[PDB]
Structure 1
Amino acid sequence: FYNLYNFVRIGRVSKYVCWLSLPLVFQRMWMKNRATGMEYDIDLENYAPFEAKKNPMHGH
Structure 2
Amino acid sequence: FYNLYNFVRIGRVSKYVCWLSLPLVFQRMWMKNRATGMEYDIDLENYAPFEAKKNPMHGH
Q: Same fold (TM over 0.5)?
A: yes
Match of 1:47 in 2: 47
Please report how far the alpha carbon of residue 16 of structure 1 lies from its aligned counterpart in structure 2 after TM superposition.
0.2
Please report how far the alpha carbon of residue 39 of structure 1 lies from its aligned counterpart in structure 2 after TM superposition.
0.1
In the aligned structure 1, how far is the partner of 2:38 from the partner of 2:16? 36
In the aligned structure 2, how far is the partner of 1:23 from the partner of 1:3? 24
Please report how far the alpha carbon of residue 25 of structure 1 lies from its aligned counterpart in structure 2 after TM superposition.
0.1
In the TM superposition, structure 1's runs of 4+ consecutive aligned residues that sit over 6 Å from their partners are none
Aligned residues: 60
Partner of 1:20, secondary structure, is helix
Match of 1:15 in 2: 15
In the aligned structure 1, how far is the partner of 2:44 from the partner of 2:50? 10
Q: What per-residue deviation string (whole Å, max 9, x for no partner) do you get for residues 5-41 of structure 1?
A: 0000000000000000000000000000000000000
RMSD: 0.2
TM-score w.r.t. length of structure 1:
0.99
In the aligned structure 2, how far is the partner of 1:41 from the partner of 1:22? 33
In the aligned structure 1, how far is the partner of 2:13 from the partner of 2:59? 47
Which structure dedicates a bigger proportion of its chain to helix?
Answer: 2
